[PDB]
Amino acid sequence: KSLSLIAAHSHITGLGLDENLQPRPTSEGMVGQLQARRAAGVILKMVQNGTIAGRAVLVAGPPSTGKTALAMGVSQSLGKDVPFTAIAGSEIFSLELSKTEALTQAFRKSIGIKIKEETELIEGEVVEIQIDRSITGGHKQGKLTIKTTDMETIYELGNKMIDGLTKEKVLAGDVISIDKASGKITKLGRSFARSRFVQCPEGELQKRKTVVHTVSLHEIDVINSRTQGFLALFTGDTGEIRSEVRDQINTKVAEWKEEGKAEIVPGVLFIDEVHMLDIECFSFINRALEDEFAPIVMMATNRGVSKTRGTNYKSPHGLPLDLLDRSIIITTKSYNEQEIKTILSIRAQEEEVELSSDALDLLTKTGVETSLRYSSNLISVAQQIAMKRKNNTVEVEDVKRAYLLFLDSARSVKYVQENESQYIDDQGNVQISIAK
Amino acid sequence: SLSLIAAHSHITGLGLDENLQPRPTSEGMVGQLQARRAAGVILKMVQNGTIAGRAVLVAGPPSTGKTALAMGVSQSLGKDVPFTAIAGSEIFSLELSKTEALTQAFRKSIGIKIKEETELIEGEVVEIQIDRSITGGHKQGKLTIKTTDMETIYELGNKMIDGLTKEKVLAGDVISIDKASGKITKLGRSFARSRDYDAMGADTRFVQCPEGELQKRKTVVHTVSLHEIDVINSRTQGFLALFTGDTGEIRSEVRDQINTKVAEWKEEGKAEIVPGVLFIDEVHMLDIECFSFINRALEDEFAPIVMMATNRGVSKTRGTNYKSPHGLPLDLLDRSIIITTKSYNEQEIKTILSIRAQEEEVELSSDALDLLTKTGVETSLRYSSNLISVAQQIAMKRKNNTVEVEDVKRAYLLFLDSARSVKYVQENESQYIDDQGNVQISIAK
Amino acid sequence: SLPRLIYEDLILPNYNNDVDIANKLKNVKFNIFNPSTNYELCLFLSKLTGEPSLNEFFRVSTTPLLKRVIERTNGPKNTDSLSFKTITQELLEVTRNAPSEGVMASLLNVEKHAYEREYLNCIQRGYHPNVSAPPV
Amino acid sequence: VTRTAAHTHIKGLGLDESGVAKRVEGGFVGQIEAREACGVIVDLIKAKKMSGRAILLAGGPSTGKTALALAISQELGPKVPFCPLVGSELYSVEVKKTETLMENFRRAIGLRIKETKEVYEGEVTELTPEDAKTISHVIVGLKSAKGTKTLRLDPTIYESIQREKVSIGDVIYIEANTGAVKRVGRSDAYATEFDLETEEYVPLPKGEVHKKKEIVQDVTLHDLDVANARPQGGQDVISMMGQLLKPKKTEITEKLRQEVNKVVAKYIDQGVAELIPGVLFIDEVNMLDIEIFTYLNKALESNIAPVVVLASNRGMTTVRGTEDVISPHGVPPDLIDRLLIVRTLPYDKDEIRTIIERRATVERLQVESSALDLLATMGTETSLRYALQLLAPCGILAQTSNRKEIVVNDVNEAKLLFLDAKRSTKILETSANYL
Amino acid sequence: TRTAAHTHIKGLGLDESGVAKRVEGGFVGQIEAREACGVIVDLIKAKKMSGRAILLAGGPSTGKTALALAISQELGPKVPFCPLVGSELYSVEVKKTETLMENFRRAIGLRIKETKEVYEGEVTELTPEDAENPLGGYGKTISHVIVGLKSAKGTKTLRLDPTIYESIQREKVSIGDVIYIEANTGAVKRVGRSDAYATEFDLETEEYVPLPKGEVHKKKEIVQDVTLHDLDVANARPQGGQDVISMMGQLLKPKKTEITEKLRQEVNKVVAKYIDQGVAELIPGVLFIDEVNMLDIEIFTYLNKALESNIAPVVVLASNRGMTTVRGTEDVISPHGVPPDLIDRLLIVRTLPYDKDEIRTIIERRATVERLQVESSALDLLATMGTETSLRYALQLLAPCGILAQTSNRKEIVVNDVNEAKLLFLDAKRSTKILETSANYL
Ligand SMILES: Nc1ncnc2c1ncn2[C@@H]1O[C@H](COP(=O)(O)OP(=O)(O)O)[C@@H](O)[C@H]1O
Ligand SMILES: Nc1ncnc2c1ncn2[C@@H]1O[C@H](COP(=O)(O)OP(=O)(O)O)[C@@H](O)[C@H]1O
Ligand SMILES: Nc1ncnc2c1ncn2[C@@H]1O[C@H](COP(=O)(O)OP(=O)(O)O)[C@@H](O)[C@H]1O
Ligand SMILES: Nc1ncnc2c1ncn2[C@@H]1O[C@H](COP(=O)(O)OP(=O)(O)O)[C@@H](O)[C@H]1O
């Protein structure tokens, strides 16, 4: 499951830390940024403890300095079964939902209910089905010889089981699972009989299994609101869910928690590029962070002393000071030559690219000259240029050809400022003619 | 009941004489003699009903009694005359235009009066016998209805049989049948059969067995505004649009056929026309398009009398970039007559505070009333009005029943007015967020 | 996948929840179209619409839209009412069973004339959906 | 186990019988005058006589306005309604803002209803209907482990019984007052009629068949408004799939509000209903537009409007939607004249230290006194909120080195990892490329 | 009797083949504008041109709307007249272009005539006569249906198709009811029950229409007047259909939709086909827009497009602005708020202010319409009042004067009553002087 080709943060499998929350120099695909990784590990221990709620953490720094990488590492080290809602800042300006309603849905998607239940199933291999039918179809009789690798039995079947076996046609040689209470019969496949293919089950026929369900609060909010069904969880037209059913869900969840029938898991809400939110969003967040059913909100931004959207003044990080009072700030730093070389080596091993040493030094030099992402993007173009001339190892001139073909930001600005008469300026004046 | 002590609930009508001369203090209104006389003239204009499309404007400073005068006009208007009181911000909708919202607000304020007669047969069903012919084209019905006093036998038609087969009665339900129109309803089940079925169910209800005379005659009067007819003749089942507001830009053709048919109904003699008043409080924040539509729509015969209230000085008009008196353009101010209110003095403030204290069932001493009068002289009037209500609770916490000067002083010290709040903000400006988003959170430098 | 706890404690009634009690309190006891408590409003609406049954508004306000569409019956209404015949409904009614070469029917039969002129009943189909799926 | 989120150490106002505030009581430290004013407001709300009274409490950020509002809501109790709101929630894309404000106004007036629940539940042992094509009544026999009981039922409930596919031997659930019929499943006595069946098998109920219970229903006025203003129509009891056409919110007319008020006023006089007014709390009132500020003046003059409590932390600020209206707290002078203003004062060093100790107690952490002095100095130097939010990283870093107790070095380490706004601004200013 | 700011004017008041006289038809003064409006009325009655535009301009309280209503009264009630405000085009359901096109199509009328051959009256007998050789496997095969009808002074027995008996059964036609059968379609409809069958049952719902006058069979020629917009909204919406979409949309909110140009073209070609047959007459009318400065430049551009159409009616625009910026533009200075592209496409009629004697005569006519009696010196003082402040202020101060005269138990307005009405009700200038000379947020 979970198909994926290659991502920009696909080499990161978690925060590289020891048992004392100390960062290794290189572990789980993350190098450098020791203090930020330690602080994110402390935040991970906050999430794993779960005894506190509504704490806001801001990750701020220069662009292309391990912010989204840190968020991806926290999400990978959280594991499965714990909600993680990663949204962008421009995703809440909707046309059918208000900004506060979309923010409320994104807040309530990150708190889960854990419910354990038990059900009994008959998973077996069908030896023989015998069906006795009448002329008019009044009374049906049925014998079912079914087995595992451990037992063997014969069952008399009633009329509704005859109807449920005729529908979704079960033949001899099949492996099926039957639910007695609901009457759901699933064909797992065919057994190992050459005369798809699965293994015949072992042990008892009538098994009792415990399944664990994690249901978000937003799902129960959609279900309890009678105006729309559960298909609004998939189609997306929930449409301004009222606060009365939210109050009923908030009371019933605590009622289940006191009786021990369910458990509370908190999650992480990540807001990438938080500076694009409006002032009314920040004013809503300032009061939504103080609820008992509030997750931990991590926000990432790279702006420095910019204009707050919806106002006319300037604020640090694009955020007003009342929101910044309610947050603790993790600050990232720029990378050195050695860490850039290590990151580029990790990305070379990730994309199955074989690199010479001098090509790696050239990539590190042009990475500390221009950008990390530019050298991270040249490394796969140079492999195709290498494969055009039929050799596996990327050499120095293979990097030089890709450097010549594909430009960066500074060279493009230089060439545009040199030949600005051929481009459209702000005033809309261009020159298309060559002569005169 | 479902009415608490409101902001101005002491006003019960306009305190005028038979020669339109205002009393100094009667019917809850104190002072403002010229404004009350002008409001009495406008009230006589409404009660005459021979004129249409006139615009007055109540202009004054804040806390003077413009909406108090409007409440007095509405209370002295009497029942069954439509009075539509809206604010300025109500007409900005997302699924209705401002022109259509103003049209609906205009046509909600003029009604028609229809008289009709009812012959009611209300009783408990005993036995229904259905006789069917051999051909079956015609059926007869023997109905045994009863009251606590007399019972009788009625003959039914086939349409009675069809109408009683639907919403089927089960020989012991309470129904009521009209004779002139044939209206059929099922009120519920009698209390004599309440211990019969051991579980009532979803769609049943219990009513008392009707008593007295089985036959009754009653004349009823209905007042229907033109907006109700506009909504009803626009859909198939339109009363849901009457109660949910999803009418959605009703067309003009149905409006002109309803105007023509109501003129025909007035000419025939079935119904009569009752004009009313449309009150717009805080009229200054309407767009210039709304003002254009208003001074064109004031020229129709089916137009009510529009009372507009405002308190702005020479201020800008919304939708434009220039200033005008009262926030209204001069084209609208040409077609208007202005009633101007005047600020109060010590004695009128004292009398209004005494009336508001009597209305809230709060007993004061003379010294506390004089202190509240001095505070309402210095500060506004509503501050003293709220000070009375909080000083009553401060009095009752002391196991004392009358409000003393200590309680008024404590309520003055606990709660602040506008000027002291402005002074405390301006002295401590570093601790508040200013217009540029700057704030000194920390107490140490 | 949905657990049994939410379904049991939130949808179906049992002894520890008040789903049915709140439903009866909201939809029956406090309904404003109830003739047992709001007879004057029912009489007013019966004069307004001309409906011969006073229990019709309760039936309309407590039924789904599709069900109300399906069993809609063209019942008769009395003449003494305020709901009259709007002109476009009269134009819709005079062409219900009118034949061809009548002036009102021909002025009201634009779309079938466009259908029969443009040879649309022998045209082919150029678009098919790529995926067809049942509900979840 | 227990979750703490910026509150829940606040239990109330901590006043005595005479309304005088204690210094440290109820989780509140200091703030005598605002707590006394809030207690007077709580008594006025408990008096249950006046409508449309308003209160605005103003002060600097991190001073205790929202804590005082929550203390008022805790002092009133859970029976009285309390509607919290932010000023940004009044802007919706389905209806106008005035409709949202009126809906939130009517959400704060509640009704208490005395009701009875009557339940029959057991095994169906006899299902005999009798007519006079139209059935007259059905006799249903029920059996539980304490005995049997026979009932008569009307054809209406019989239609729901047949719709639920109830046969002889199923365990059913019949509510007497509502007529709702629920089928649980077949019984374990009929579990051996076949070796394999699709029916679920439940045991017999242990208690008696007939159960009676007294219940109390709380319903707001907006619930009665929305129960009658359904545009599509009524809905069924059980529906996992929604209606095909989406029902959106609509501008509810005042005629429906008047009829709902007429029905409630009729029901109150019979003693069935009890009326309880409540509190509408609006935090961050400076986010409101001038049109909502104008409509608030009309809405405060109604006969059924609840007590409204506002809060703002601004100074002389331009009202949103206007250009040159400079007014205190971002509130126009028309609404301020209808208000009563309660001031909130900032704290000194010892109250900050006491608040930090109180928050460390409720979070189950043990702090050294020398670390507490450093935390108080940090709180006075930067912010009280920054000192409060640094307690949990100190606890985690103390738990890392196998200690149940906070040392000064943990405070220094947590200060090194996490920054406040001022040091972030200093890094922002002396930087090259976007921090 | 209701009077509202108008209805003292009955047409323009011109004589035939000539000019306006000084006072006639409720008009005082304004001779040249009345003559120009009469020429425009004659051009409209000529029924030839299309898309001609008249802009009449002047100051406030001059009589532009009165002239437009006088044009509407002079044309008569059979010619369509669509009044409009420039603020009405901004709708939140459909674009303003579609609203302008709908108001364009509302102003053109169609007069149609038709002949109906009917048979109506009370049923005397209803016998489905069986056939001579019935077919096997069936029951009651019908050869014809004999229906007898009775009305006032005439009875007649009919001989019908076998098919109509199905419609008789579906429409629940019993004996004694009054039925209605048109010739070519069949389609019996049940109009009610006779009044002679009213009092045999105590309780019934069915109405009792009496016996119809005239013979049972009469051909009646009817004449119907529709508009093109009615035909457009009738052809665009579907008829009574059996599909779920038609019944679902009929119970839902009638949301306005963008009518295509194809439907309009088909409507125009079928209307032209029936006009050429000699059955239908086309009556163009007037579309009147008041305060056209409220339109922005997009609606002005679509007006430029739509005035060059083949079917567009006569449009009359009113405005009172001078050198004003056009709405939607920041730097275009234009007369009357109208851009020069539209200004080049219309004819401008200028209206002039009044003097003291004309103000006195207008006040006299408005007093004699409102059934009031004014003294002569009070009339002169009211004319002086109208000269000093406004004509509309002098006109609106008449009913308070009558009420104050009635309160003193007199039937005549005197000087003291108009002084009391002066002191009680203010005008714009004195209210502005009160606002300027006060500093308490007045
Ligand atoms: N500590 C790290 N370990 C591994 N890769 C890193 C690290 N820091 C940055 N990167 C790489 O640098 C790129 C920029 O990181 P990212 O945080 O997404 O940019 P920004 O800081 O602009 O959000 C990413 O593709 C990531 O793979
Ligand atoms: N003449 C009066 N008699 C009694 N009460 C008055 C009078 N004038 C004003 N008030 C009181 O003053 C309070 C506020 O005045 P208001 O009518 O709101 O003035 P405005 O509408 O100009 O703001 C109201 O509660 C009203 O009861
Ligand atoms: N008197 C007090 N005693 C104890 N804790 C307080 C007191 N005043 C404020 N606090 C705490 O300080 C924090 C201030 O938050 P809040 O009052 O929401 O800020 P604002 O006043 O800006 O709305 C709250 O978490 C509250 O628990
Ligand atoms: N020539 C006239 N004769 C009589 N009354 C007139 C005349 N001109 C204007 N009036 C009156 O003046 C009033 C306002 O004029 P109006 O038509 O509104 O001018 P405008 O439309 O330019 O504002 C109308 O009620 C009308 O009766």
Contact in structure between B444 and D380 (CB atoms under 8 Å): yes
Of C96, A22, A58, A136, nearest in space to E186 by CA: C96
> In angstroms, rounded to a whole number, what is the distance separating the alpha carbons of residues C26 and A410?
68
Residue A389 burial by CB count (10 A; 0-12/13-18/19+): exposed, middle or buried? exposed
With CA atoms as reference, report the closest residue to E103 among E252, E255, E259.
Answer: E259
Q: Which residues contact A221 (CB under 8 A, 6 or more apart)?
A: A108, A241, A245, A246, A249
**CA E11/CA E24 separation, integer angstroms:** 9
Q: How far is the CA of D26 from the centre of ligand 3 (A)?
A: 13
The number of C-beta contacts closer than 8 angstroms across B and C is 70
CB of B213 closer than 8 Å to CB of D170: no
Cα(B301) to ligand 4 centroid in Å equals 16
D391 CA distance to ligand 3 middle (Å): 16
Say if CB B422 and CB B385 are below 8 A apart.
no
CA pair distance D379, D373, nearest whole angstrom: 10
**Around E321, how many Cα atoms within 13 Å sit in the side-chain half-sphere?**
21
Report how far residue E80's alpha carbon sits from residue E83's, in angstroms, rounded to the nearest whole number: 10
Cβ separation of C6 and A215 shorter than 8 Å? yes
Task: Note whether A91 and A100 are within 8 A (CB).
Answer: no
Alpha-carbon distance of E304 to B221, in angstroms, equals 53
Chain D residues inside the 8 Å CB shell of C18: 115, 117, 215, 217
Nearest Cα to D433, choosing from A377, A313, A65, A376? A65
Longest dimension (CA), chain C: 70
Tokens of A401: 């050809």
- The answer to whether residues B314 and B323 touch, using CB atoms and an 8 Å cutoff, is yes
User: What is the C-alpha to C-alpha distance for residues E55 and E349, in angstroms, rounded to an integer?
Assistant: 6
Using the beta-carbon criterion (under 8 Å), do D348 and B382 form an inter-chain contact?
no
CB nearest C5 (choices: A223, A231, A262): A262
- Chain C residues lying within 8 Å of D223, measured CB to CB: 26
Residue B135 burial (C-beta neighbours within 10 Å; 0-12, 13-18, 19+): exposed
**Closest by Cβ to E4, choosing from B182, B288, B299:** B299
Instruction: Provide the experimental method for this PDB entry.
Output: cryo-EM
Distance in angstroms (rounded) separating the CA atoms of residues A400 and A407: 12
Long-range pairs for A372-377: beta carbons < 8 A, 24 or more residues apart? A372/A64, A372/A335, A372/A340, A372/A343, A373/A64, A374/A408, A375/A340, A375/A344, A376/A343, A376/A344, A376/A347, A377/A406
The answer to whether the annotation marks D63 as part of a ligand binding site is yes
Q: For chain E, give the number of residues.
A: 442
Give the closest residue to E416 by CA, choosing from B41, E407, B45, B17: E407
Rounded to whole angstroms, the Cα distance separating E434 from E441 reads 11
Ligand 4 binding pocket, CB closer than 6 Å: E 5-6, 26-30, 60-66, 362, 392
Beta pairing class for B305-310 and B110-132: unpaired
Written as six digits, the tokens of D67 are 């804590």
Q: Which ligand is nearest to the CA of D294?
A: 2
The CA distance from D327 to D342, in Å, is 17
- As separate numbers, helices (DSSP H) first and strands (DSSP E) second, chain C gives 8, 0
**What are the residue ranges of helices labelled H in E148-196?**
164-170
Mutation site for A-interface testing, chosen from B441, B442, B443 by largest number of A Cβ within 10 Å? B441
Q: Are strands A296-301 and A56-60 parallel, antiparallel or unpaired?
A: parallel
Nearest ligand 2 atom, CA B32: 1
Joined tokens for residue A225: 């609101």
- Picking from D175, D257, D268 by the largest number of C CB atoms within 10 A of its own CB, the best residue to mutate is D175
Whole-angstrom distance, CA of residue D184 vs CA of residue E7: 76
Residue D370's contacts (CB-CB under 8 Å, 6 or more residues apart) are: D408
Tell me which residues of chain B, numbers 223 to 262, contact chain D at a CB-CB cutoff of 8 Å. Answer: 240, 242-246
Element (H, E) at D220: strand D210-220
H/E run at residue D100: helix D97-106
E85 strand-pairing partners: E290
Note whether A142 and A130 are within 8 A (CB).
yes
DSSP E202: S
Instruction: Give dist(CA B223, CA B112) in Å, integer.
Output: 6
Nearest-angstrom CA–CA distance, D131 and D121? 25
Nearest to B7 by CA among B70, B56, B60: B70
Q: Give me the residue label for tokens 């007819």.
A: B229
User: How far is A40 from A330, CA to CA, in rounded Å?
Assistant: 8
Which three-class secondary structure state does DSSP give residue E323? Answer: strand
CA of A304 to the centre of ligand 1 (A): 19
SS3 for B416? strand
How far apart (Å, rounded) are the C-alpha atoms in residues E228 and B82?
37
C-beta separation of C63 from C29 below 8 A: no
Question: And the tokens for D421?
Answer: 């706004």
Task: Extract the annotated binding site of E for ATP.
Answer: 58-65
Q: Which ligand is nearest to the CA of E5?
A: 4
Q: How far apart are CA E379 and CA E373, in angstroms?
A: 10
* Cα C59 to Cα C75: distance, rounded to the nearest angstrom: 15
Please give the single-letter amino acid code of residue D158. Answer: Y
Please judge whether D91 and A280 are an interchain contact, meaning their C-beta atoms are less than 8 angstroms apart: yes
Please list the alpha-helical segments (H only) found in D150-253: 155-163, 221-226
Nearest to B31 by CA among B435, B351, B399, B274: B351
Whether residue E105 contacts residue E358, with contact meaning beta carbons closer than 8 Å, is answered with no
Query: Do residues E397 and E382 touch, judged by C-beta distance below 8 A?
Result: yes
For chain D, list the contacting chains (3+ Cβ pairs, <8 Å): A, B, C
Through-space distance between the first and last CA atoms of chain D, rounded to whole angstroms: 40
Q: Which residues contact D184 (CB under 8 A, 6 or more apart)?
A: D170, D171, D172, D173, D202
Model resolution, angstroms: 3.2
**β-pair partners for A300:** A59, A272
CA distances from A422 to A24, A407, A416, D137 (A): 52, 18, 9, 93
Distance of CA B92 to the CA centre of its chain: 20
The number of C-alpha atoms within 13 Å of D16 and in the hemisphere containing its C-beta is 8
Q: Are E349 and E36 in contact (CB under 8 A)?
A: yes
Q: What share of chain E is helix, strand, coil (3-state, %, to 5)?
A: 35, 25, 40
Cα separation, D21 vs D71, whole angstroms: 13
Task: Enumerate residues 6+ apart whose C-beta is below 8 A from D258.
Answer: none
Question: Distance between CA atoms of A154 and A160, rounded to whole angstroms?
Answer: 17
Looking at the DSSP bridge assignments, the partners of residue D21 are D15
Q: Report strand pairing: B83-87 vs B110-132.
A: unpaired
Helix E356-369 with E376-388: angle, nearest 10 deg: 120
Q: Is B190 annotated as a binding residue?
A: no
Contacts 24+ apart (CB under 8 A), C23-29: C23/D178, C23/D237, C24/B202, C24/D177, C24/D178, C25/D113, C25/D115, C25/D217, C25/D219, C26/D219, C26/D223, C26/D224, C26/D227, C27/C62, C27/D227, C27/D234, C28/B202, C28/B203, C28/B205
- What CA–CA distance (Å, rounded) separates A337 from B64? 76
Nearest ligand 4 atom, CA E58: 22
Closest CA to A129 of A86, A151, A161: A161
Per the document, the length of chain D is: 435
H helical segments located in A270-388: 279-288, 321-325, 337-350, 357-369, 372-388
- Helix boundaries (H) for B233-345: 239-244, 252-268, 288-297, 330-334
Q: Which residues contact C112 (CB under 8 A, 6 or more apart)?
A: none
Closest by CA position to B67, among listed B43, B47, B44, B87: B87
What backbone phi and psi angles, to 5 degrees, belong to E39?
-65, -40
In the DSSP assignment, the letter for residue B208 is: P
> Among candidates E426, E393, E421, which has minimal Cα distance to B340?
E426
- Amino acid identity of residue C111, one-letter, is E
Chain breaks in chain A (C to N over 2.5 A) after: 195
Quote the strand ranges of A158-242, DSSP E. Answer: 174-179, 185-190, 206-216
Close Cβ partners of D65 (under 8 Å, ≥ 6 residues apart):
D57, D58, D59, D283, D311, D313, D344
Alpha-helical (H) ranges within E277-427 are: 297-306, 340-343, 356-369, 376-388, 391-396, 399-407, 415-424
D62 shares contact with chain B (CB less than 8 Å): yes
Spatial distance between the Cα atoms of E161 and E129, rounded to a whole number of angstroms: 11
Distance from CA of E107 to the nearest CA of C (A): 16
Do D331 and D339 meet the contact criterion of CB atoms below 8 Å apart?
yes
Annotated binding site of E: 58-65
Q: Determine whether B40 is exposed, middle or buried from the number of CB atoms within 10 Å of its CB (0-12, 13-18, 19+).
A: buried
Cβ neighbours of residue E403 closer than 8 Å, sequence gap 6 or more: B41, B44, B45, B48
d(Cα B392, Cα B370) in Å, to the nearest integer? Answer: 16
- Which residues of chain A from 70 to 109 reach within 8 Å of chain D, CB to CB? 94-101
For tokens 């009701």, the residue is D115
**Amino acid in the structure at residue D24:** V
> In a 3-state reduction of DSSP, which class is residue A153?
strand
Structure tokens at D190: 């009929």
> What are E439's two structure tokens?
């500093």
Which of E65, E71, E289, E336, when mutated, tests ligand 4's pocket best, judged by the most ligand atoms within 8 Å of its CB?
E65
Q: Are D410 and A21 in contact (CB under 8 A)?
A: no
Residues 6+ apart with CB under 8 A from A346: A11, A29, A31
Pick the ligand that lies closest to the CA of residue B27. 2
Rounded-to-integer distance, Cα A2 and Cα E106, Å: 61
> H or E segment at B124?
strand B110-132
For helices A357-369 and A396-405, the axis angle rounded to 10 degrees is 30
- Specify whether the CB–CB gap between B70 and B308 falls below 8 A: no
Cα A340–chain centre separation = 27
> Nearest to residue D397, comparing CAs of D417, D372, D425?
D417
* Residue C60 phi, psi dihedral angles, 5° rounding: -70, -40
